[PDB]
Protein backbone atom coordinates (compact mmCIF):
# COMPACT_ATOMS: atom_id res chain seq x y z
CA UNK A 1 0.00 0.00 0.00
CA UNK A 2 1.14 3.54 -0.81
CA UNK A 3 -2.00 5.71 -0.54
CA UNK A 4 -1.36 6.32 3.16
CA UNK A 5 2.20 7.42 2.38
CA UNK A 6 0.90 9.92 -0.18
CA UNK A 7 -1.68 11.23 2.30
CA UNK A 8 0.98 11.71 4.99
CA UNK A 9 3.30 13.42 2.50
CA UNK A 10 0.55 15.81 1.42
CA UNK A 11 -0.44 16.55 5.02
CA UNK A 12 3.11 17.37 6.13
CA UNK A 13 3.72 19.43 2.98
CA UNK A 14 0.53 21.43 3.52
CA UNK A 15 1.54 22.02 7.14
CA UNK A 16 5.04 23.14 6.17
CA UNK A 17 4.07 25.38 3.24
CA UNK A 18 1.13 27.00 5.02
CA UNK A 19 3.05 27.63 8.23
CA UNK A 20 6.17 28.98 6.51
CA UNK A 21 4.24 31.23 4.12
CA UNK A 22 2.00 32.53 6.89
CA UNK A 23 4.94 33.23 9.19
CA UNK A 24 6.88 35.06 6.47
CA UNK A 25 3.80 37.06 5.45
CA UNK A 26 3.22 38.00 9.10
CA UNK A 27 6.85 39.10 9.39
CA UNK A 28 6.44 41.15 6.21
CA UNK A 29 3.35 42.84 7.65
CA UNK A 30 5.08 43.51 10.97
CA UNK A 31 8.07 45.07 9.21
CA UNK A 32 5.63 47.11 7.14
CA UNK A 33 4.06 48.49 10.31
CA UNK A 34 7.55 49.81 11.11
CA UNK A 35 9.56 52.10 8.83
CA UNK A 36 11.38 49.15 7.24
CA UNK A 37 9.05 48.58 4.28
CA UNK A 38 10.82 48.19 0.93
CA UNK A 39 9.78 47.80 -2.72
CA UNK A 40 10.81 44.13 -2.79
CA UNK A 41 8.30 43.48 0.00
CA UNK A 42 5.34 43.53 -2.40
CA UNK A 43 7.06 41.05 -4.70
CA UNK A 44 7.93 38.68 -1.87
CA UNK A 45 4.48 38.97 -0.31
CA UNK A 46 2.75 38.20 -3.60
CA UNK A 47 5.10 35.27 -4.22
CA UNK A 48 4.03 34.07 -0.77
CA UNK A 49 0.38 34.57 -1.75
CA UNK A 50 0.97 32.48 -4.88
CA UNK A 51 2.51 29.84 -2.62
CA UNK A 52 -0.60 29.90 -0.43
CA UNK A 53 -2.72 29.56 -3.57
CA UNK A 54 -0.67 26.50 -4.53
CA UNK A 55 -1.09 25.08 -1.03
CA UNK A 56 -4.85 25.68 -0.80
CA UNK A 57 -5.83 24.82 -4.40
CA UNK A 58 -3.18 22.45 -5.80
CA UNK A 59 -2.37 20.59 -2.56
CA UNK A 60 -5.52 20.61 -0.42
CA UNK A 61 -7.78 18.70 -2.87
CA UNK A 62 -5.20 15.93 -3.26
CA UNK A 63 -4.61 15.75 0.50
CA UNK A 64 -8.31 15.08 1.15
CA UNK A 65 -8.64 11.49 -0.05
CA UNK A 66 -12.32 11.45 0.93
CA UNK A 67 -12.98 14.21 -1.65
CA UNK A 68 -10.44 13.35 -4.38
CA UNK A 69 -11.17 9.61 -4.37
CA UNK A 70 -13.82 10.17 -7.04
CA UNK A 71 -14.06 14.00 -7.13
CA UNK A 72 -17.65 13.85 -5.91
CA UNK A 73 -19.74 16.95 -6.52
CA UNK A 74 -21.35 19.07 -9.22
CA UNK A 75 -19.40 19.83 -12.37
CA UNK A 76 -19.13 23.45 -11.22
CA UNK A 77 -17.05 22.41 -8.20
CA UNK A 78 -14.63 20.36 -10.30
CA UNK A 79 -14.32 23.06 -12.95
CA UNK A 80 -13.58 25.69 -10.30
CA UNK A 81 -11.06 23.43 -8.56
CA UNK A 82 -9.14 22.71 -11.77
CA UNK A 83 -9.20 26.38 -12.76
CA UNK A 84 -7.84 27.33 -9.34
CA UNK A 85 -5.12 24.67 -9.54
CA UNK A 86 -3.90 25.91 -12.92
CA UNK A 87 -4.15 29.52 -11.71
CA UNK A 88 -1.97 28.63 -8.74
CA UNK A 89 0.62 26.94 -10.95
CA UNK A 90 0.70 29.84 -13.40
CA UNK A 91 0.99 32.32 -10.52
CA UNK A 92 3.80 30.39 -8.85
CA UNK A 93 5.77 30.42 -12.11
CA UNK A 94 5.01 34.01 -13.10
CA UNK A 95 5.70 35.54 -9.68
CA UNK A 96 9.25 34.19 -9.93
CA UNK A 97 9.36 35.47 -13.50
CA UNK A 98 8.23 38.91 -12.30
CA UNK A 99 10.79 38.88 -9.48
CA UNK A 100 13.57 38.15 -11.96
CA UNK A 101 12.27 40.88 -14.27
CA UNK A 102 12.31 43.23 -11.28
CA UNK A 103 15.93 42.29 -10.60
CA UNK A 104 16.74 43.01 -14.25
CA UNK A 105 14.98 46.38 -14.00
CA UNK A 106 16.66 47.33 -10.72
CA UNK A 107 20.14 46.13 -11.75
CA UNK A 108 20.58 46.56 -15.51
CA UNK A 109 18.53 49.78 -15.82
CA UNK A 110 17.55 51.01 -12.33
CA UNK A 111 15.24 53.84 -13.39
CA UNK A 112 12.11 55.37 -11.85
CA UNK A 113 9.95 52.59 -13.28
CA UNK A 114 8.22 51.80 -9.96
CA UNK A 115 5.17 53.79 -11.05
CA UNK A 116 1.97 53.46 -9.00
CA UNK A 117 3.82 51.26 -6.52
CA UNK A 118 2.16 51.23 -3.13
CA UNK A 119 2.46 49.83 0.37
CA UNK A 120 -0.92 48.14 -0.11
CA UNK A 121 1.02 45.14 -1.49
CA UNK A 122 0.50 45.53 -5.23
CA UNK A 123 2.30 46.91 -8.27
CA UNK A 124 2.01 46.72 -12.05
CA UNK A 125 4.16 43.62 -12.78
CA UNK A 126 2.51 41.49 -10.09
CA UNK A 127 -1.02 42.40 -11.14
CA UNK A 128 0.00 41.69 -14.74
CA UNK A 129 1.23 38.25 -13.68
CA UNK A 130 -1.94 37.51 -11.71
CA UNK A 131 -4.17 38.60 -14.60
CA UNK A 132 -2.16 36.49 -17.05
CA UNK A 133 -2.43 33.50 -14.72
CA UNK A 134 -6.20 33.98 -14.53
CA UNK A 135 -6.58 34.36 -18.30
CA UNK A 136 -4.28 31.53 -19.42
CA UNK A 137 -6.04 29.06 -17.10
CA UNK A 138 -9.48 29.83 -18.56
CA UNK A 139 -9.33 26.77 -20.90
CA UNK A 140 -9.71 24.66 -17.74
CA UNK A 141 -13.42 25.58 -17.61
CA UNK A 142 -14.03 23.85 -20.97
CA UNK A 143 -12.23 20.53 -20.38
CA UNK A 144 -13.06 18.94 -17.02
CA UNK A 145 -16.80 18.49 -16.40
CA UNK A 146 -17.90 15.66 -14.08
CA UNK A 147 -16.43 13.06 -16.43
CA UNK A 148 -15.49 10.58 -11.20
CA UNK A 149 -14.16 13.84 -12.63
CA UNK A 150 -11.80 13.32 -15.57
CA UNK A 151 -10.55 15.14 -18.64
CA UNK A 152 -13.15 15.28 -21.42
CA UNK A 153 -10.58 16.11 -24.13
CA UNK A 154 -4.57 15.21 -30.69
CA UNK A 155 -6.21 17.44 -28.09
CA UNK A 156 -4.37 16.07 -25.06
CA UNK A 157 -0.85 16.14 -26.48
CA UNK A 158 -1.29 19.59 -28.04
CA UNK A 159 -2.82 21.03 -24.87
CA UNK A 160 -0.12 19.58 -22.60
CA UNK A 161 2.59 20.87 -24.94
CA UNK A 162 0.94 24.30 -24.80
CA UNK A 163 0.74 24.17 -20.99
CA UNK A 164 4.37 23.14 -20.59
CA UNK A 165 5.45 25.80 -23.10
CA UNK A 166 3.49 28.60 -21.43
CA UNK A 167 4.00 27.69 -17.76
CA UNK A 168 7.53 26.28 -17.69
CA UNK A 169 9.64 26.54 -20.85
CA UNK A 170 8.82 30.14 -21.80
CA UNK A 171 8.98 31.65 -18.28
CA UNK A 172 12.11 29.60 -17.59
CA UNK A 173 13.80 30.78 -20.78
CA UNK A 174 12.89 34.38 -20.00
CA UNK A 175 14.25 33.95 -16.48
CA UNK A 176 17.47 32.42 -17.83
CA UNK A 177 17.93 35.32 -20.24
CA UNK A 178 17.31 37.81 -17.44
CA UNK A 179 19.73 35.93 -15.18
CA UNK A 180 22.56 35.87 -17.73
CA UNK A 181 22.00 39.58 -18.39
CA UNK A 182 22.03 40.33 -14.65
CA UNK A 183 25.16 38.22 -14.20
CA UNK A 184 26.89 40.18 -16.97
CA UNK A 185 25.85 43.52 -15.46
CA UNK A 186 26.96 42.47 -11.98
CA UNK A 187 30.31 41.26 -13.30
CA UNK A 188 30.76 44.59 -15.09
CA UNK A 189 30.01 46.44 -11.84
CA UNK A 190 32.42 44.19 -9.93
CA UNK A 191 35.15 44.82 -12.50
CA UNK A 192 34.57 48.58 -12.33
CA UNK A 193 34.76 48.57 -8.53
CA UNK A 194 37.90 46.43 -8.69
CA UNK A 195 39.44 48.95 -11.09
CA UNK A 196 38.63 51.81 -8.72
CA UNK A 197 40.09 49.83 -5.82
CA UNK A 198 43.25 49.18 -7.84
CA UNK A 199 43.59 52.88 -8.63
CA UNK A 200 43.23 53.70 -4.93
CA UNK A 201 45.82 51.03 -4.13
CA UNK A 202 48.29 52.51 -6.61
CA UNK A 203 47.71 55.95 -5.10
CA UNK A 204 48.46 54.60 -1.62
CA UNK A 205 51.54 52.60 -2.65
CA UNK A 206 53.07 55.54 -4.51
CA UNK A 207 52.29 57.81 -1.55
CA UNK A 208 54.25 55.39 0.64
CA UNK A 209 57.11 55.36 -1.88
CA UNK A 210 57.19 59.17 -1.89
CA UNK A 211 57.24 59.13 1.91
CA UNK A 212 60.25 56.78 1.85
CA UNK A 213 61.91 58.38 -1.20
CA UNK A 214 65.19 60.25 -0.67
CA UNK A 215 65.91 62.01 -3.98
CA UNK A 216 64.34 63.96 -6.83
CA UNK A 217 63.53 60.82 -8.79
CA UNK A 218 61.03 58.40 -7.24
CA UNK A 219 59.19 61.63 -6.40
CA UNK A 220 58.95 63.24 -9.81
CA UNK A 221 58.37 59.60 -10.63
CA UNK A 222 55.71 57.84 -8.55
CA UNK A 223 53.79 61.10 -8.75
CA UNK A 224 53.10 60.42 -12.43
CA UNK A 225 51.69 57.01 -11.54
CA UNK A 226 49.56 58.70 -8.88
CA UNK A 227 48.34 61.28 -11.41
CA UNK A 228 47.43 58.59 -13.94
CA UNK A 229 45.64 56.61 -11.24
CA UNK A 230 43.67 59.68 -10.14
CA UNK A 231 42.70 60.54 -13.71
CA UNK A 232 41.53 56.96 -14.30
CA UNK A 233 39.67 56.86 -10.98
CA UNK A 234 37.71 60.10 -11.30
CA UNK A 235 36.42 58.88 -14.67
CA UNK A 236 34.87 55.73 -13.18
CA UNK A 237 31.20 56.59 -12.74
CA UNK A 238 29.08 54.80 -10.14
CA UNK A 239 27.36 51.65 -11.41
CA UNK A 240 23.78 51.69 -12.62
CA UNK A 241 22.67 50.67 -9.11
CA UNK A 242 22.85 54.36 -8.12
CA UNK A 243 21.32 57.34 -9.88
CA UNK A 244 23.36 59.96 -11.75
CA UNK A 245 21.78 63.43 -11.59
CA UNK A 246 23.17 66.97 -11.31
CA UNK A 247 23.84 68.15 -7.74
CA UNK A 248 24.37 64.49 -6.81
CA UNK A 249 27.26 63.82 -4.40
CA UNK A 250 28.83 61.44 -6.93
CA UNK A 251 28.92 64.12 -9.65
CA UNK A 252 30.25 67.10 -7.69
CA UNK A 253 31.41 65.83 -4.29
CA UNK A 254 33.33 62.96 -5.93
CA UNK A 255 34.69 64.64 -9.07
CA UNK A 256 35.56 67.75 -7.14
CA UNK A 257 37.53 66.08 -4.39
CA UNK A 258 39.33 64.26 -7.17
CA UNK A 259 39.98 67.65 -8.79
CA UNK A 260 41.60 68.90 -5.58
CA UNK A 261 43.53 65.62 -5.39
CA UNK A 262 44.94 65.99 -8.90
CA UNK A 263 45.69 69.65 -8.18
CA UNK A 264 47.71 68.64 -5.13
CA UNK A 265 49.49 66.02 -7.25
CA UNK A 266 50.29 68.79 -9.74
CA UNK A 267 51.66 70.98 -6.95
CA UNK A 268 53.83 68.12 -5.71
CA UNK A 269 55.13 67.53 -9.24
CA UNK A 270 55.83 71.25 -9.63
CA UNK A 271 57.86 71.21 -6.41
CA UNK A 272 59.70 68.03 -7.41
CA UNK A 273 60.70 69.40 -10.81
CA UNK A 274 62.70 72.15 -9.06
CA UNK A 275 64.77 69.73 -6.96
CA UNK A 276 62.94 70.65 -3.73
CA UNK A 277 62.36 67.05 -2.71
CA UNK A 278 61.90 67.98 0.95
CA UNK A 279 59.11 70.41 0.06
CA UNK A 280 57.52 67.85 -2.26
CA UNK A 281 57.37 65.44 0.68
CA UNK A 282 54.96 67.76 2.50
CA UNK A 283 52.44 67.53 -0.35
CA UNK A 284 52.52 63.76 0.13
CA UNK A 285 51.17 64.17 3.67
CA UNK A 286 48.76 66.89 2.51
CA UNK A 287 47.24 64.45 0.00
CA UNK A 288 45.91 62.21 2.78
CA UNK A 289 43.38 64.78 3.99
CA UNK A 290 41.81 64.86 0.52
CA UNK A 291 42.17 61.09 0.07
CA UNK A 292 40.21 60.23 3.22
CA UNK A 293 37.34 62.72 2.71
CA UNK A 294 35.61 62.22 -0.65
CA UNK A 295 36.80 58.82 -1.88
CA UNK A 296 37.05 56.32 0.99
CA UNK A 297 33.40 56.79 1.95
CA UNK A 298 32.39 56.43 -1.70
CA UNK A 299 34.32 53.16 -1.95
CA UNK A 300 32.71 51.80 1.22
CA UNK A 301 29.24 52.78 0.00
CA UNK A 302 29.83 51.25 -3.43
CA UNK A 303 31.09 48.00 -1.92
CA UNK A 304 28.15 47.78 0.49
CA UNK A 305 25.55 48.52 -2.20
CA UNK A 306 27.12 46.00 -4.58
CA UNK A 307 27.08 43.41 -1.80
CA UNK A 308 23.41 44.11 -1.08
CA UNK A 309 22.29 43.82 -4.71
CA UNK A 310 24.48 40.73 -5.13
CA UNK A 311 22.76 39.16 -2.12
CA UNK A 312 19.32 39.92 -3.56
CA UNK A 313 20.35 38.54 -6.95
CA UNK A 314 21.70 35.41 -5.26
CA UNK A 315 18.37 34.98 -3.46
CA UNK A 316 16.49 35.31 -6.75
CA UNK A 317 18.89 32.89 -8.45
CA UNK A 318 18.44 30.35 -5.65
CA UNK A 319 14.65 30.63 -5.92
CA UNK A 320 14.86 30.18 -9.70
CA UNK A 321 17.20 27.19 -9.42
CA UNK A 322 14.94 25.48 -6.88
CA UNK A 323 11.91 26.31 -9.03
CA UNK A 324 13.44 24.69 -12.11
CA UNK A 325 14.90 21.67 -10.33
CA UNK A 326 11.60 20.94 -8.55
CA UNK A 327 9.15 21.60 -11.42
CA UNK A 328 11.11 20.16 -14.36
CA UNK A 329 10.90 16.57 -13.03
CA UNK A 330 7.10 16.89 -13.07
CA UNK A 331 6.55 18.79 -16.33
CA UNK A 332 9.02 16.58 -18.21
CA UNK A 333 7.12 13.41 -17.26
CA UNK A 334 3.90 14.81 -18.70
CA UNK A 335 5.66 16.13 -21.78
CA UNK A 336 7.22 12.71 -22.38
CA UNK A 337 4.18 10.52 -21.62
CA UNK A 338 1.15 12.66 -22.59
CA UNK A 339 1.19 11.65 -26.28
CA UNK A 340 -0.01 8.07 -25.68
CA UNK A 341 4.47 8.22 -25.51
CA UNK A 342 6.22 4.90 -24.84
CA UNK A 343 4.15 3.71 -21.86
CA UNK A 344 2.02 4.86 -18.92
CA UNK A 345 3.66 7.14 -16.37
CA UNK A 346 2.25 5.54 -13.22
CA UNK A 347 4.07 7.78 -10.67
CA UNK A 348 2.10 11.03 -10.53
CA UNK A 349 1.68 12.18 -6.92
CA UNK A 350 5.33 12.22 -5.86
CA UNK A 351 6.47 14.46 -8.73
CA UNK A 352 3.75 17.03 -8.01
CA UNK A 353 4.59 16.95 -4.30
CA UNK A 354 8.25 17.56 -5.15
CA UNK A 355 7.10 20.48 -7.29
CA UNK A 356 5.11 21.92 -4.38
CA UNK A 357 8.21 21.58 -2.20
CA UNK A 358 9.48 24.64 -4.08
CA UNK A 359 6.54 26.70 -2.84
CA UNK A 360 7.16 25.23 0.61
CA UNK A 361 10.81 26.34 0.61
CA UNK A 362 10.51 29.83 -0.92
CA UNK A 363 9.76 31.59 2.41
CA UNK A 364 12.71 29.89 4.10
CA UNK A 365 14.99 30.99 1.26
CA UNK A 366 13.78 34.57 1.59
CA UNK A 367 14.17 34.62 5.38
CA UNK A 368 17.68 33.15 5.17
CA UNK A 369 18.62 35.71 2.52
CA UNK A 370 16.85 38.61 4.30
CA UNK A 371 18.19 40.33 7.41
CA UNK A 372 14.82 41.92 8.18
CA UNK A 373 13.16 38.52 8.59
CA UNK A 374 16.27 36.86 10.03
CA UNK A 375 16.23 39.30 12.96
CA UNK A 376 12.61 38.24 13.57
CA UNK A 377 13.70 35.43 15.89
CA UNK A 378 11.19 36.39 18.61
CA UNK A 379 7.54 36.25 17.53
Amino acid sequence: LLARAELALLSIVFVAVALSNGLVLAALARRGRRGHWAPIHVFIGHLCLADLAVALFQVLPQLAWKATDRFRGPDALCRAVKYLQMVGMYASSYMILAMTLDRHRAICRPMLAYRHGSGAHWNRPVLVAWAFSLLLSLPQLFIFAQRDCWACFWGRRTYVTWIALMVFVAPTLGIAACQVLIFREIHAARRQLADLEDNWETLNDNLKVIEKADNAAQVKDALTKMRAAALDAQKATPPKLEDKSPDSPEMKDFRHGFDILVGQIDDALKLANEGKVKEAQAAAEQLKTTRNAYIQKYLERARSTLAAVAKTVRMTLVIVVVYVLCWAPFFLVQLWAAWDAPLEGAPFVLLMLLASLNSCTNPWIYASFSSSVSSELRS
Epitope: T224, R227, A228, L231, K235, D266, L269
Partner: antibody, heavy 124, light 109 residues
Framework: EVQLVESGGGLVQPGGSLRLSCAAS????????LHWVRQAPGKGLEWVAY????????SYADSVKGRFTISADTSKNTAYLQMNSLRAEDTAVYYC?????????????????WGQGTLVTVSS | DIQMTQSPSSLSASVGDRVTITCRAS??????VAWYQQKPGKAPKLLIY???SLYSGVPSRFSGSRSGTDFTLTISSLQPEDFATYYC??????????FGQGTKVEIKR
Protein backbone atom coordinates in the same frame (compact mmCIF):
# COMPACT_ATOMS: atom_id res chain seq x y z
CA GLU B 1 39.92 84.42 -33.44
CA VAL B 2 42.53 82.33 -31.62
CA GLN B 3 45.93 82.31 -33.30
CA LEU B 4 49.58 81.72 -32.36
CA VAL B 5 52.21 83.47 -34.50
CA GLU B 6 55.88 82.49 -34.30
CA SER B 7 58.78 84.76 -35.19
CA GLY B 8 62.54 85.03 -34.75
CA GLY B 9 63.58 81.88 -36.60
CA GLY B 10 66.48 82.16 -39.00
CA LEU B 11 70.13 81.33 -39.59
CA VAL B 12 72.51 81.31 -36.62
CA GLN B 13 75.98 79.78 -36.56
CA PRO B 14 76.53 76.78 -34.25
CA GLY B 15 77.23 77.87 -30.70
CA GLY B 16 75.26 81.09 -31.22
CA SER B 17 72.14 82.49 -29.61
CA LEU B 18 68.60 82.94 -30.89
CA ARG B 19 65.23 84.15 -29.60
CA LEU B 20 61.85 82.79 -30.69
CA SER B 21 58.73 84.83 -29.93
CA CYS B 22 55.23 83.31 -29.93
CA ALA B 23 52.48 85.94 -29.95
CA ALA B 24 48.93 84.96 -29.01
CA SER B 25 45.78 86.63 -30.33
CA UNK B 26 42.23 85.86 -29.24
CA UNK B 27 43.22 84.71 -25.75
CA UNK B 28 45.39 85.71 -22.79
CA UNK B 29 48.55 83.75 -22.00
CA UNK B 30 47.62 83.90 -18.31
CA UNK B 31 44.73 81.48 -18.87
CA UNK B 32 46.81 79.03 -20.93
CA UNK B 33 50.19 77.32 -20.73
CA LEU B 34 52.35 77.91 -23.80
CA HIS B 35 54.44 74.98 -25.02
CA TRP B 36 57.23 74.92 -27.60
CA VAL B 37 57.34 71.74 -29.71
CA ARG B 38 60.02 71.24 -32.37
CA GLN B 39 59.97 68.93 -35.40
CA ALA B 40 63.26 68.03 -37.04
CA PRO B 41 63.42 67.94 -40.86
CA GLY B 42 61.69 64.76 -41.99
CA LYS B 43 61.19 63.51 -38.43
CA GLY B 44 58.48 63.23 -35.81
CA LEU B 45 57.45 65.87 -33.32
CA GLU B 46 59.15 66.21 -29.95
CA TRP B 47 58.38 68.49 -27.02
CA VAL B 48 61.01 71.15 -26.29
CA ALA B 49 59.79 73.33 -23.43
CA TYR B 50 56.80 75.02 -21.81
CA UNK B 51 55.84 78.01 -19.67
CA UNK B 52 52.93 78.57 -17.29
CA UNK B 53 52.58 82.33 -16.83
CA UNK B 54 50.23 82.13 -13.84
CA UNK B 55 52.66 80.08 -11.72
CA UNK B 56 55.96 80.83 -13.48
CA UNK B 57 56.55 77.07 -13.72
CA UNK B 58 59.02 76.60 -16.55
CA SER B 59 60.26 73.22 -17.74
CA TYR B 60 62.56 71.83 -20.41
CA ALA B 61 63.37 68.57 -22.14
CA ASP B 62 66.41 66.53 -21.14
CA SER B 63 68.15 67.48 -24.40
CA VAL B 64 67.70 71.27 -24.03
CA LYS B 65 67.84 71.69 -20.25
CA GLY B 66 70.40 74.29 -19.19
CA ARG B 67 70.70 75.90 -22.64
CA PHE B 68 67.11 76.97 -23.35
CA THR B 69 65.27 79.62 -21.33
CA ILE B 70 61.49 79.96 -21.60
CA SER B 71 59.85 83.16 -20.36
CA ALA B 72 56.53 84.93 -20.85
CA ASP B 73 55.40 88.57 -20.95
CA THR B 74 51.70 89.10 -20.27
CA SER B 75 51.90 92.83 -21.06
CA LYS B 76 52.86 91.93 -24.64
CA ASN B 77 50.96 88.62 -24.40
CA THR B 78 53.93 86.72 -25.83
CA ALA B 79 56.19 83.81 -24.91
CA TYR B 80 59.94 83.92 -25.55
CA LEU B 81 62.36 81.02 -25.94
CA GLN B 82 66.04 81.96 -25.74
CA MET B 83 68.26 79.22 -27.18
CA ASN B 84 71.99 79.39 -26.41
CA SER B 85 74.92 77.09 -27.15
CA LEU B 86 73.12 75.76 -30.21
CA ARG B 87 74.25 72.47 -31.75
CA ALA B 88 73.85 70.75 -35.12
CA GLU B 89 70.69 68.81 -34.23
CA ASP B 90 68.87 71.91 -32.93
CA THR B 91 67.80 72.72 -36.50
CA ALA B 92 64.04 72.25 -36.77
CA VAL B 93 60.61 73.85 -37.18
CA TYR B 94 59.44 75.16 -33.80
CA TYR B 95 55.69 75.42 -33.22
CA CYS B 96 54.04 77.22 -30.31
CA UNK B 97 51.11 75.26 -28.90
CA UNK B 98 48.52 76.20 -26.29
CA UNK B 99 47.30 73.97 -23.46
CA UNK B 100 44.52 74.70 -20.97
CA UNK B 101 44.65 74.36 -17.18
CA UNK B 102 43.76 71.29 -15.18
CA UNK B 103 40.51 72.01 -13.28
CA UNK B 104 38.19 71.65 -16.28
CA UNK B 105 37.95 70.61 -19.94
CA UNK B 106 40.61 73.02 -21.30
CA UNK B 107 43.16 70.53 -19.94
CA UNK B 108 41.60 67.49 -21.61
CA UNK B 109 41.96 69.37 -24.90
CA UNK B 110 45.63 68.80 -25.67
CA UNK B 111 47.54 71.16 -27.94
CA UNK B 112 44.59 72.45 -29.96
CA UNK B 113 45.78 75.78 -31.42
CA TRP B 114 49.29 75.39 -32.81
CA GLY B 115 51.26 78.13 -34.52
CA GLN B 116 52.56 78.48 -38.05
CA GLY B 117 56.00 77.24 -37.00
CA THR B 118 59.36 78.95 -37.47
CA LEU B 119 62.29 77.18 -39.12
CA VAL B 120 65.74 77.50 -37.52
CA THR B 121 68.88 76.08 -39.14
CA VAL B 122 72.34 75.91 -37.57
CA SER B 123 75.37 75.22 -39.75
CA SER B 124 78.94 76.42 -40.21
CA ASP C 1 60.18 59.12 -20.15
CA ILE C 2 57.03 57.38 -21.38
CA GLN C 3 57.50 55.71 -24.76
CA MET C 4 54.68 56.08 -27.29
CA THR C 5 55.62 53.58 -30.00
CA GLN C 6 53.41 53.78 -33.10
CA SER C 7 53.58 50.43 -34.89
CA PRO C 8 52.42 51.26 -38.46
CA SER C 9 55.44 53.26 -39.65
CA SER C 10 53.63 53.69 -42.97
CA LEU C 11 50.33 52.59 -44.46
CA SER C 12 48.92 52.44 -48.00
CA ALA C 13 45.18 52.67 -48.62
CA SER C 14 42.60 53.63 -51.23
CA VAL C 15 39.63 55.98 -51.08
CA GLY C 16 36.73 54.35 -49.26
CA ASP C 17 39.05 52.00 -47.34
CA ARG C 18 39.05 51.61 -43.56
CA VAL C 19 42.47 52.45 -42.09
CA THR C 20 43.57 51.79 -38.50
CA ILE C 21 46.61 53.14 -36.66
CA THR C 22 47.75 51.92 -33.24
CA CYS C 23 49.74 53.39 -30.36
CA ARG C 24 51.15 51.82 -27.19
CA ALA C 25 52.40 53.60 -24.06
CA SER C 26 55.20 52.46 -21.76
CA UNK C 27 53.31 53.28 -18.57
CA UNK C 28 49.56 53.35 -17.95
CA UNK C 29 48.62 56.89 -18.84
CA UNK C 30 44.94 57.72 -18.46
CA UNK C 31 42.68 58.55 -21.41
CA UNK C 32 45.09 61.50 -21.80
CA VAL C 33 46.07 60.68 -25.38
CA ALA C 34 45.47 62.79 -28.48
CA TRP C 35 45.64 62.16 -32.22
CA TYR C 36 46.91 64.83 -34.62
CA GLN C 37 47.07 65.08 -38.41
CA GLN C 38 49.88 66.94 -40.18
CA LYS C 39 50.12 67.67 -43.90
CA PRO C 40 53.37 68.66 -45.65
CA GLY C 41 54.40 72.14 -44.54
CA LYS C 42 51.52 72.70 -42.09
CA ALA C 43 51.24 72.57 -38.33
CA PRO C 44 49.45 69.55 -36.84
CA LYS C 45 45.68 69.57 -36.44
CA LEU C 46 44.04 68.16 -33.31
CA LEU C 47 41.76 65.40 -34.57
CA ILE C 48 41.05 63.53 -31.32
CA TYR C 49 41.53 65.48 -28.09
CA UNK C 50 40.97 62.65 -25.60
CA UNK C 51 41.49 58.90 -25.87
CA UNK C 52 38.20 58.82 -27.81
CA SER C 53 36.60 62.25 -28.28
CA LEU C 54 36.20 63.95 -31.65
CA TYR C 55 37.32 67.57 -31.82
CA SER C 56 34.86 70.32 -32.72
CA GLY C 57 35.62 70.74 -36.42
CA VAL C 58 36.82 67.26 -37.42
CA PRO C 59 34.84 64.98 -39.76
CA SER C 60 32.97 62.25 -37.91
CA ARG C 61 34.65 59.46 -39.89
CA PHE C 62 37.70 59.72 -37.64
CA SER C 63 37.20 57.73 -34.44
CA GLY C 64 39.52 57.12 -31.51
CA SER C 65 39.40 54.21 -29.09
CA ARG C 66 41.23 52.97 -26.00
CA SER C 67 41.77 49.57 -24.41
CA GLY C 68 44.01 49.49 -21.36
CA THR C 69 47.29 50.94 -22.63
CA ASP C 70 46.58 50.57 -26.38
CA PHE C 71 45.03 53.44 -28.33
CA THR C 72 43.70 53.34 -31.88
CA LEU C 73 42.66 55.85 -34.55
CA THR C 74 40.34 54.60 -37.29
CA ILE C 75 39.15 56.24 -40.50
CA SER C 76 36.16 54.51 -42.07
CA SER C 77 35.80 56.21 -45.47
CA LEU C 78 39.27 57.43 -46.41
CA GLN C 79 38.69 60.62 -48.42
CA PRO C 80 41.21 62.03 -50.92
CA GLU C 81 42.20 64.68 -48.34
CA ASP C 82 42.84 62.17 -45.53
CA PHE C 83 46.36 61.48 -46.86
CA ALA C 84 48.72 62.93 -44.26
CA THR C 85 50.98 61.96 -41.38
CA TYR C 86 49.20 61.00 -38.15
CA TYR C 87 50.78 61.48 -34.72
CA CYS C 88 49.83 60.03 -31.34
CA UNK C 89 50.61 62.11 -28.25
CA UNK C 90 50.41 61.30 -24.55
CA UNK C 91 49.98 64.41 -22.42
CA UNK C 92 49.69 63.12 -18.86
CA UNK C 93 51.44 66.17 -17.38
CA UNK C 94 52.80 69.47 -18.67
CA UNK C 95 56.41 68.22 -18.66
CA UNK C 96 55.64 64.62 -19.70
CA UNK C 97 54.22 65.08 -23.21
CA UNK C 98 55.55 62.62 -25.78
CA PHE C 99 54.60 62.06 -29.41
CA GLY C 100 54.74 58.97 -31.59
CA GLN C 101 56.97 58.42 -34.59
CA GLY C 102 54.04 58.92 -36.97
CA THR C 103 52.39 56.99 -39.80
CA LYS C 104 52.33 58.35 -43.35
CA VAL C 105 49.11 57.43 -45.16
CA GLU C 106 49.56 57.31 -48.94
CA ILE C 107 47.43 56.52 -51.98
CA LYS C 108 47.22 53.03 -53.48
CA ARG C 109 47.77 52.10 -57.12
Amino acid sequence: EVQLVESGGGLVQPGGSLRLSCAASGFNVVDFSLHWVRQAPGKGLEWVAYISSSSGSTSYADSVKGRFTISADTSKNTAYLQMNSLRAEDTAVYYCARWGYWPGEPWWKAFDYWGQGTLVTVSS
Amino acid sequence: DIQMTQSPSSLSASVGDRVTITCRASQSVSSAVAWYQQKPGKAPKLLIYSASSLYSGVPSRFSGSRSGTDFTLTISSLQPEDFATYYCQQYLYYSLVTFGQGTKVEIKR
